[PDB]
Amino acid sequence: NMVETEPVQGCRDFPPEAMRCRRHLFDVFHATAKTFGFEEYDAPVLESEELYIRKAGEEITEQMFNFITKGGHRVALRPEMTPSLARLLLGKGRSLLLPAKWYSIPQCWRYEAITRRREHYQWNMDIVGVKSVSAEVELVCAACWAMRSLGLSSKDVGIKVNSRKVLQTVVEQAGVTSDKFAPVCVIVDKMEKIPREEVEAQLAVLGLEPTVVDAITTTLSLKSIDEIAQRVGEEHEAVKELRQFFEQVEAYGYGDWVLFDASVVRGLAYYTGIVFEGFDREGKFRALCGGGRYDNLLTTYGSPTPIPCAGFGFGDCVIVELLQEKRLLPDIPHVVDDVVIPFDESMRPHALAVLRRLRDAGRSADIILDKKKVVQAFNYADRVGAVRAVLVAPEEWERGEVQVKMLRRGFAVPLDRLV
Amino acid sequence: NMVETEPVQGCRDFPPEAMRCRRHLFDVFHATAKTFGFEEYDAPVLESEELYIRKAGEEITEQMFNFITKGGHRVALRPEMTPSLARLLLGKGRSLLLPAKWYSIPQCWRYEAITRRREHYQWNMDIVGVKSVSAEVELVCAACWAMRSLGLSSKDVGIKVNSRKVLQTVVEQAGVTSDKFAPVCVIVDKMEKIPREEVEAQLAVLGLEPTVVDAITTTLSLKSIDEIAQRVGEEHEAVKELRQFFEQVEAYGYGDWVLFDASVVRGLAYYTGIVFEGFDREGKFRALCGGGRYDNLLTTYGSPTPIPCAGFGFGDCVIVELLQEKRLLPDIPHVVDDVVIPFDESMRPHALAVLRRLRDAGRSADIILDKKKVVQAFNYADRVGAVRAVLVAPEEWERGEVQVKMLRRGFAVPLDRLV
Ligand SMILES: Nc1ccc2cccc(O)c2n1
Ligand SMILES: Nc1ccc2cccc(O)c2n1
Ligand SMILES: Nc1ccc2cccc(O)c2n1
Ligand SMILES: Nc1ccc2cccc(O)c2n1
Ligand SMILES: N[C@@H](Cc1c[nH]c[nH+]1)C(=O)O
Ligand SMILES: N[C@@H](Cc1c[nH]c[nH+]1)C(=O)O
């Protein structure tokens, strides 16, 4: 009998070759988070289904990987991290010191009728307790920093930015009760990649008249902040905020990375203010990352006081395709410093003591574990990219030495000199 | 309405405080693996239930966290990593270069009728393609290395070691067909922590006579390798192997960490040779880690040629309790190098440029994001353990300077000198 060697439908294996690629990326996510002063957290991949019941026609909750425990409890593999984060924050209450800057790199999950990936890793960064656009500034700079760290430039990618408050106004001024607003953002998010007829249809389903639909479409196609200003005023808070945002990003030195786009809304119900989305400037890939401000979610979860929040998620799949296309993911193979080679099996104990010493000195080192010829041991050393082979032979050992060969003739060296 | 702030039954939250503890541990697991030349891998937490159907009464497979997809597919959250590893190895075939030394730190899962933890993280280390006890030597040394790295000594803990081949002989020589052997190990593993009557009963259920049961119990209580040698001969391969194992561990310098214990068998069906288990020398905690040789598993999975393997798993929960008891987990709080403080909001752009510079130089740095008084900014700096506060004020800025205050009076410094 033969076991199924392929992973479960829509899930990825990470043998060493693929793991090095993932590690290269996560190392940047971690390093960027540390540079920016964010704290790591984590929570269970398994959460209560109840945590995601938002009733706004979101794709994320529609495609929920859910099931029922033997105990009858309705659960899901998390489709996103933000609800888990909020649960932790709400759990802490007044004991949480603010501001708080928390990051994680959870695997998140989806399930579709179409048998597409069902899992991905998503770097999450969130700032909690900060009212002003400085939070969004910092988050957008963090995302650019990560991409620049990966070797991309502002010629390769950007982050396009908007605020939902502009549309909020239009919807409210058009006589539509604010309860329809989140559903509208969800529908209008689809504007980009499906027919306008199909989107207009969906909005009409919500009970909004053609004239109201009109204003929405128009405001999505406005190309500048000044044209927004003409539409809603120069001190509509949206304008002041976006200007402050762009000014602050410019002062940090990432002005070439960011721009305004009135069509950016995102697909999540809970964004209340600034929203943003990373993209490739060749128009070839899906969104690289996405985020925004969500000031009401915690109130929504039963927080007795409103807690301002903003953040983003940054997936592991699209960024990697982009990097591959741009030839910014060279395979650096697995490597070690030293390979210790017993001359024969009688030298194994001596070679072990040498191994101990090298590792004690902070070196990465292998020892040849099987019985083999010296030449094969050198073949192995080359396979693992050793800087150095350390041959432990009877002759040198009697002199208190080993034979060392730099791989990146051969020379006898006292034990103490090795390290 | 209030959302449930507690995590799902039997699952842990990792807010920053708990995450630092976990990170401290994983950092050792990673560092130890690199020191020993192991390669990282990963696979999906979700695997086919079929992968674990071993039919040997194992607790691990009995307590399987399984469910059925909407597609009707029988799946589980992995109870262990070793089957996933084997799937990857079998998937590679002849293209896998040997030897291979692979590690991972998967979250693994269980489900019980008793509502105990249902998840844990388990450092896995495995050596593939090595016939000789040198593999086991290296794995046991790796486990000790990790524990010593965490600040434990050979007075605190040990690893007790045995080989199943001794018992294999007894079972086979007693006329019991080898198919009963794995089930027997599974039963005898329970010997330790349940009544002997209850264990003897279970073996009788398998159809083994009282005389055969007798020999098993006796051999479990033999206290030395010499007494095993008297029982099965000095060149029963078990004896030679254990002697070689102990000799090699002694030569690496971890002789005080290891010992022989004829009662150690482990609960897993697939161990064929040497097996081992980490323990605390005060007899206070459950097993810290556990592993062994499993030379038949890949054959069992349909590998057309036998592939030798050995490894262990090292849980994240018991080790941490031990470390807490031993006071080896001091809370090091979250820290940053620098906190940049705008004197007021008019200095925010200048302060951002300063932030850019510090981060460009590899420093971890925050900027005060909200509007606040300088004194509050210093309170925040103290909260995040900054080495340095960098006050960006109009006066100094006009001189091309900032004001720097070492936290671990205050002095003006040119921008360029900061880094
Ligand atoms: N929300 C999710 C959850 C899981 C995903 C897997 C692959 C790609 C995605 O965009 C995913 N999005
Ligand atoms: N030991 C090292 C260190 C760095 C290396 C870079 C590329 C290829 C190698 O084999 C390397 N080996
Ligand atoms: N096999 C497993 C799988 C999950 C576990 C969770 C907590 C403690 C354990 O010993 C576990 N063992
Ligand atoms: N920046 C640092 C660096 C090291 C520290 C150690 C303990 C407490 C601290 O606040 C520390 N802050
Ligand atoms: N949860 C969002 C990203 C995000 C993090 N924080 C705020 N938003 C998503 O999956 O797109
Ligand atoms: N899978 C084993 C540990 C192990 C890893 N490799 C071999 N054995 C366990 O969970 O106990």
Q: Which residues of A140-165 are buried (b: 16+ CB within 10 A; e: fewer)?
A: bbbbbbbbbebebebebbbbbbbbbb
Residue B313 in tokens: 């798993």
Instruction: Say how far apart CA A356 and CA B252 lie, in whole Å.
Output: 6
Residue B318 in tokens: 């018991």
Residues of chain B with a following break (C to N over 2.5 Å) = 115, 408
Nearest to A322 by CA among A157, A85, A124: A157
CA angle B138, B143, B146 (to 5 degrees): 120
Quick check: CB of A109 below 6 Å from ligand 1? yes
Helix, strand, coil share (%) of chain B residues, nearest 5? 40, 20, 40
Give contacts of A3 with chain B, Cβ < 8 Å: 50-51, 86-87, 90, 301-302
Quick check: CB of B317 below 6 Å from ligand 4? no
Q: At what angle do helices B181-189 and B210-220 cross, to 10 degrees?
A: 60
Instruction: Say how far apart CA B208 and CA B210 lie, in whole Å.
Output: 7
Quick check: A355 and B252 CB within 8 A? yes
Quick check: CB of B385 below 6 Å from ligand 4? yes
Residue A407 in tokens: 């791989």
CB atoms within 10 A of CB B331: 8
CA atoms in the 13 A half-sphere facing the CB of B16: 17
Any binding-site annotation on A243? no
CA atoms in the 13 A half-sphere facing the CB of A299: 10
Q: What are phi and psi of A367, to 5 degrees?
A: -120, 140
CB atoms within 10 A of CB A177: 9
- How do the domains of chain A map onto residue ranges? 1-328, 329-419
Cα-Cα-Cα-Cα torsion B180, B181, B187, B193, nearest 10 degrees, comes to 170
B134-to-A12, B129, B259 alpha-carbon distances in Å: 32, 11, 16
Question: What number of residues does chain A have?
Answer: 419
CB B55 within 8 A of CB B24: no
Q: Per DSSP, which regions of A38-164 are E strands?
A: 39-40, 46-48, 65-68, 74-77, 100-104, 107-109, 119-128, 157-163
Shortest CB distance from B88 goes to which of A8, A13, A251? A13
Please report, in range form, the residues annotated as the binding site of B for L-histidine. Answer: 80-82, 110, 122, 126, 266, 270-271
Quick check: B48 and A4 CB within 8 A? yes
CA atoms in the 13 A half-sphere facing the CB of B113: 2
Nearest to B90 by CA among B347, B300, B250, B396: B300
CA atoms in the 13 A half-sphere facing the CB of B142: 37
DSSP 8-state symbol, A175: T
Instruction: Say how far apart CA B85 and CA B88 lie, in whole Å.
Output: 5
Please report, in range form, the residues annotated as the binding site of B. Answer: 80-82, 110, 122, 126, 266, 270-271
Question: What is the DSSP code string of B330-399?
Answer: --PPP--SEEEEESSGGGHHHHHHHHHHHHHTT--EEE--S---HHHHHHHHHHTT-SEEEEE-HHHHHT
Strand, helix or coil for residue B121: strand
Sign (positive or negative) of CA dihedral A5, A7, A13, A17? positive
Query: A336 exposed, middle or buried (CB, 10 Å; 0-12, 13-18, 19+)?
Result: buried
Instruction: State how beta strands A39-40 and A100-104 pair.
Output: parallel
Question: What is the DSSP code string of B85-149?
Answer: HHHHHHHHGGGS-SSEEEEE--EEE---S----SEEEEEEEEEES--STHHHHHHHHHHHHHHHH
Q: Which residues of A223-237 are buried (b: 16+ CB within 10 A; e: fewer)?
A: eebeebbebbeeebe
Q: Which residue of B has its CA nearest to A339?
A: B37
Nearest to A245 by CA among A298, A299, A310, A191: A310
B107 CA distance to ligand 3 middle (Å) = 9
Give contacts of B349 with chain A, Cβ < 8 Å: 247-248, 250-251
CB B46 within 8 A of CB A8: yes
Instruction: Say how far apart CA B155 and CA A43 lie, in whole Å.
Output: 35
Strand, helix or coil for residue A168: helix
CATH-assigned architecture of domain B1-328: 2-Layer Sandwich (3.30)
DSSP 8-state symbol, B14: B
CB B106 within 8 A of CB B81: yes
Quick check: B370 and A99 CB within 8 A? yes
Residue B100 region by backbone torsions, left for phi larger than 0, else alpha for psi between -120 and 50, else beta: beta
Q: How many interchain CB pairs under 8 A, A with B?
A: 236
Residue that has been written with the tokens 């009135």 in this structure: A262
Instruction: Say how far apart CA B215 and CA B24 lie, in whole Å.
Output: 46
DSSP 8-state symbol, A407: -
CB B352 within 8 A of CB A251: yes
The 8 Å CB, 24+ separation contacts for B233-239 are B236/B165, B236/B166, B236/B169, B237/B165, B238/B163, B238/B165, B238/B166, B238/B169
Q: What are phi and psi of B185, to 5 degrees?
A: -50, -45
CB A353 within 8 A of CB B253: yes
Question: What is the Cα gyration radius of chain B?
Answer: 28
Instruction: Say how far apart CA A258 and CA A12 lie, in whole Å.
Output: 33
CB A351 within 8 A of CB A392: yes
Query: CA of A95, closest CA in chain B: separation in Å?
Result: 13
Is the link from the previous residue into A99 a cis peptide, with omega within 30 of 0?
yes
Instruction: Say how far apart CA A47 and CA B7 lie, in whole Å.
Output: 7
* DSSP H helices in A36-70: 59-62
Quick check: CB of A387 below 6 Å from ligand 2? yes
Which residues partner with B258 through β-bridges? B159
Atom of ligand 1 nearest to the CA of A116: 7
Residues of chain A with a following break (C to N over 2.5 Å) = 115, 408
Residue that has been written with the tokens 């709400």 in this structure: A90
Instruction: Say how far apart CA A33 and CA A311 lie, in whole Å.
Output: 13
- Residue from B32, B131, B352, B382 to probe the interface with A (highest A Cβ count within 10 Å): B352
Question: What number of residues does chain B have?
Answer: 419
Q: What are phi and psi of A218, to 5 degrees?
A: -60, -50
Residue that has been written with the tokens 């019980």 in this structure: B112
Spatial CB neighbours of A376, under 8 Å, sequence gap ≥ 6: none
Nearest to A418 by CA among A365, A372, A371, A374: A365
Quick check: A353 and B251 CB within 8 A? yes
Instruction: Say how far apart CA A215 and CA A210 lie, in whole Å.
Output: 9
Nearest to A357 by CA among A337, A329, A377: A337
Ligand with the closest atom to the CA of A44: 3
Resolution (Å units): 2.1
Ligand 3: residue of B110, B288, B312 to mutate (most ligand atoms within 8 A of CB) is B110
Residue that has been written with the tokens 């591959």 in this structure: A324
**Per-residue three-class SS string for A187-218:** HHHCCCCCCHHHHHHHHHHCCCCHHHHHHHHH
Q: Which residues of A247-267 are buried (b: 16+ CB within 10 A; e: fewer)?
A: ebbbbbbbeebbebbbbbbbb
Q: Per DSSP, which regions of B240-302 are E strands?
A: 258-260, 274-280, 289-293
The 8 Å CB, 24+ separation contacts for B90-99 are B90/A3, B90/A5, B90/B298, B90/B301, B90/B302, B90/B303, B91/A5, B91/A6, B91/A13, B92/A15, B96/B128, B97/A383, B98/B128, B98/B129, B98/B130, B99/A369, B99/A370, B99/B127, B99/B128, B99/B129, B99/B130
Is the link from the previous residue into B83 a cis peptide, with omega within 30 of 0?
no
Residue that has been written with the tokens 């300088």 in this structure: B374
Instruction: Say how far apart CA B137 and CA A351 lie, in whole Å.
Output: 13
Residue A351 in tokens: 């070679």
Nearest to B403 by CA among B359, B349, B338: B338
Report the CATH fold assignment for B329-419: Rossmann fold (3.40.50)
Residue B42 in tokens: 């990963």
Instruction: Say how far apart CA B28 and CA B37 lie, in whole Å.
Output: 14
Give contacts of B103 with chain A, Cβ < 8 Å: none
Q: Which helix (H) or strand (E) holds B412?
A: strand B411-414
State how far Cα B365 lies from the chain centre.
32
Strand, helix or coil for residue A21: helix
Shortest CB distance from A44 goes to which of B35, B119, B384? B119
Measured distance between the N- and C-terminal CA atoms of chain B, rounded to whole angstroms: 50
Residue A149 in tokens: 């760290």
Strand, helix or coil for residue A159: strand
CB atoms within 10 A of CB B383: 12
Measured distance between the N- and C-terminal CA atoms of chain A, rounded to whole angstroms: 50
Quick check: CB of A119 below 6 Å from ligand 1? yes
Number of H helices, E strands in chain B: 15, 17
Amino acid making up residue B340: V
Sign (positive or negative) of CA dihedral A70, A74, A78, A79? positive
A219-to-A161, B204, B211 alpha-carbon distances in Å: 14, 80, 88
Strand, helix or coil for residue B141: helix
Question: What is the DSSP code string of A304-318?
Answer: SS---EEEEEEESSH
Residue B244 in tokens: 């070689």
Q: How was this structure determined?
A: X-ray
CB A368 within 8 A of CB A339: yes
Q: What is the largest CA-CA distance in chain A?
A: 95
Nearest to B294 by CA among B122, B145, B82: B82
Residue A201 in tokens: 């249809």
Q: Which residue of B has its CA nearest to A45?
A: B11
Instruction: Say how far apart CA A192 and CA A189 lie, in whole Å.
Output: 7
Instruction: State how beta strands B100-104 and B39-40 pair.
Output: parallel
Query: A79 exposed, middle or buried (CB, 10 Å; 0-12, 13-18, 19+)?
Result: buried
Instruction: Say how far apart CA B333 and CA B331 lie, in whole Å.
Output: 6
Ligand with the closest atom to the CA of B330: 4
CB atoms within 10 A of CB B18: 14
Nearest to B247 by CA among B145, B133, B159, B166: B133
CB atoms within 10 A of CB A301: 19
Strand, helix or coil for residue A179: helix
Ligand with the closest atom to the CA of B386: 4
Quick check: B135 and A70 CB within 8 A? no
Instruction: Say how far apart CA A136 and CA A92 lie, in whole Å.
Output: 23
Nearest to B166 by CA among B250, B227, B210: B227
Residue B97 in tokens: 């270069």
Spatial CB neighbours of B238, under 8 Å, sequence gap ≥ 6: B163, B165, B166, B169, B228, B232
CB atoms within 10 A of CB A335: 12
Amino acid making up residue B69: T
Instruction: Say how far apart CA A208 and CA A184 lie, in whole Å.
Output: 10
Q: Which residues of B397-418 are buried (b: 16+ CB within 10 A; e: fewer)?
A: beeebbbbbeeeeeeeeeeeeb
Cα-Cα-Cα-Cα torsion B128, B288, B226, B178, nearest 10 degrees, comes to -60
Q: What are phi and psi of A402, to 5 degrees?
A: -125, 170
- Residue from A2, A13, A77 to probe the interface with B (highest B Cβ count within 10 Å): A13
Q: What are phi and psi of A152, to 5 degrees?
A: -80, 155
Residue A13 in tokens: 């294996």
* DSSP H helices in A233-340: 237-252, 297-300, 318-325
